[PDB]
Design an enzyme around this catalytic site. Structure first.
Site, PDB file in Angstrom:
ATOM      1  N   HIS A  68       0.793  -1.254   0.000  1.00 15.18           N
ATOM      2  CA  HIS A  68       0.000   0.000   0.000  1.00 15.18           C
ATOM      3  C   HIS A  68       0.812   1.283   0.000  1.00 15.18           C
ATOM      4  O   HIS A  68       0.150   2.314  -0.120  1.00 15.18           O
ATOM      5  CB  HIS A  68      -1.015   0.019   1.153  1.00 15.18           C
ATOM      6  CG  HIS A  68      -1.926  -1.137   1.077  1.00 15.18           C
ATOM      7  ND1 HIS A  68      -2.905  -1.269   0.082  1.00 15.18           N
ATOM      8  CD2 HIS A  68      -2.126  -2.199   1.890  1.00 15.18           C
ATOM      9  CE1 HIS A  68      -3.573  -2.370   0.273  1.00 15.18           C
ATOM     10  NE2 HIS A  68      -3.109  -2.985   1.376  1.00 15.18           N
TER      11      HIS A  68
ATOM     12  N   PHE B 250      -5.193  -2.129   5.127  1.00 15.35           N
ATOM     13  CA  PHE B 250      -5.904  -1.033   4.460  1.00 15.35           C
ATOM     14  C   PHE B 250      -7.371  -1.402   4.411  1.00 15.35           C
ATOM     15  O   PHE B 250      -7.695  -2.466   3.841  1.00 15.35           O
ATOM     16  CB  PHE B 250      -5.371  -0.878   3.044  1.00 15.35           C
ATOM     17  CG  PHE B 250      -5.820   0.414   2.412  1.00 15.35           C
ATOM     18  CD1 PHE B 250      -5.145   1.613   2.615  1.00 15.35           C
ATOM     19  CD2 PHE B 250      -6.990   0.444   1.678  1.00 15.35           C
ATOM     20  CE1 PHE B 250      -5.586   2.789   2.032  1.00 15.35           C
ATOM     21  CE2 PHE B 250      -7.465   1.632   1.157  1.00 15.35           C
ATOM     22  CZ  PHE B 250      -6.764   2.796   1.341  1.00 15.35           C
ATOM     23  N   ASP B 251      -8.235  -0.601   5.039  1.00 12.43           N
ATOM     24  CA  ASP B 251      -9.683  -0.914   5.200  1.00 12.43           C
ATOM     25  C   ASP B 251     -10.534  -0.283   4.094  1.00 12.43           C
ATOM     26  O   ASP B 251     -11.424  -1.029   3.599  1.00 12.43           O
ATOM     27  CB  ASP B 251     -10.240  -0.465   6.544  1.00 12.43           C
ATOM     28  CG  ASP B 251     -11.345  -1.376   7.060  1.00 12.43           C
ATOM     29  OD1 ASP B 251     -11.129  -2.612   7.049  1.00 12.43           O
ATOM     30  OD2 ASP B 251     -12.381  -0.845   7.502  1.00 12.43           O
TER      31      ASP B 251
END
Lengths: 124, 124
Positions: free
Chosen positions: B12, B120-121
């Site tokens: 990410h 990472f949501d």
């Protein structure tokens, strides 16, 4: 005056071939890149990947540098490299090298704005 | 064995630029970060802010995670991101992605010591 970024390109980049090239490669390349000018540089690695792919390593895995500085980065992918190692028979100004091809992760030191490679630390 | 914090940075973080130069960014990036090895990872976001700025999200707005855990945090500010989504016609091993730039809040799960992003949501 040669920038640190440009010096890294001269000493360590060779995108023009995918692999070793030949048993001659290090003898030709150490000379042509001016690494046999003042002395036989005893070890030197060339990377056979695009400049953009080696610059991108500055955004990859942060690792300690051999000198204890924190600004080294390890490539997530393996890269095509050639290691040049001075032979015993090698006597300046007739510098002689063994050419070895490998596929390994590189570790480079990055500096500046833009943040770019300036030193070749290691391969693993 | 890769730590969750390290896996978050690999999947990410792309602190390099403040966007992505070409429509080919995701094809290249999904490759360079080992997200096309066994299968094409279908969806993935890259964040183009400093690692320090992203880690500081762990001290910002606490929110529930998708999975119902309570250790998620929304960035107070918008951040430069790139959304990578596989095309409808993409077939492993020639993983093909549409690149989209955006400026959005990020939501991350935080854990560990130091207390840093590990998942990472979403972007909002």
């Amino acid at each position: 005056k040669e920038t640190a970024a440009a010096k890294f390109e001269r000493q360590h980049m060779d995108s023009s071939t995918s692999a070793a090239s030949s048993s001659n490669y290090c003898n030709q390349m150490m000379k042509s890149r001016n690494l046999t000018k003042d002395r036989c540089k005893p070890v030197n690695t060339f990377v056979h990947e695009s400049l953009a792919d080696v610059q991108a390593v500055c955004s990859q895995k942060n690792v300690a540098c051999k000198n204890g500085q924190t600004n080294c980065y390890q490539s997530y992918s393996t890269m095509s490299i050639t290691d040049c190692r001075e032979t015993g028979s090698s006597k300046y100004p007739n510098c002689a090298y063994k050419t070895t091809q490998a596929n390994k992760h590189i570790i480079v030191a990055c500096e500046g704005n833009p943040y770019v490679p300036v030193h070749f630390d290691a391969s693993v």
